[PDB]
Amino acid sequence: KVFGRCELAAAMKRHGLDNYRGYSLGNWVCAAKFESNFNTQATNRNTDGSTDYGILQINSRWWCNDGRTPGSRNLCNIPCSALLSSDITASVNCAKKIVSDGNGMNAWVAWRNRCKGTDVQAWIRGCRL
């Protein structure tokens, strides 16, 4: 599913991400924009052979199981396929654990490089929330 910007902002709010660990909804919408272009089915193989899955491009090295990332953990206790669903519950539940891991949203490379410090409120500007 390809979410619209405000449609995702709403979903993310409904699932408890708005200001989770102190990150405003605009931060999450911006991370999703640059990780997956709001497409829940996004996948991208990393050079280390891990893969990133879903709206927030969560990596199989640590967070989910895809059966093809030797040495990995599955700290969200989910199959990576669950991170590709139209329903964002699994991606949100996992992101909450990732953002709680000690480095905040720096875990999302696209957030660090393209969202951090910027006017992230632009991402929810205009949305009925």
UniProtKB/Swiss-Prot annotation:
Substrate binds at residue 101. One of its GO terms (molecular function) is beta-N-acetylglucosaminidase activity. It catalyses: Hydrolysis of (1->4)-beta-linkages between N-acetylmuramic acid and N-acetyl-D-glucosamine residues in a peptidoglycan and between N-acetyl-D-glucosamine residues in chitodextrins. In the egg white and polymorphonuclear leukocytes. Residues 1-129 form the C-type lysozyme domain. Disulfide bonds join 6-127, 30-115, 64-80, 76-94. It holds the Pfam family Lys. PROSITE patterns: GLYCOSYL_HYDROL_F22_1, GLYCOSYL_HYDROL_F22_2. It is found in: Secreted. One of its GO terms (biological process) is defense response to Gram-negative bacterium. It comes from the Eukaryota. The keyword Signal applies. InterPro entries: Glyco_hydro_22, Glyco_hydro_22_CS, Glyco_hydro_22_lys, Lysozyme-like_dom_sf. PANTHER family: LYSOZYME C (PTHR11407:SF28). Lysozyme C is capable of both hydrolysis and transglycosylation; it also shows a slight esterase activity. It acts rapidly on both peptide-substituted and unsubstituted peptidoglycan, and slowly on chitin oligosaccharides. This is Lysozyme C. It comes from Gallus gallus (Chicken). The lineage of its organism: Eukaryota, Metazoa, Chordata, Craniata, Vertebrata. The gene is LYZ.
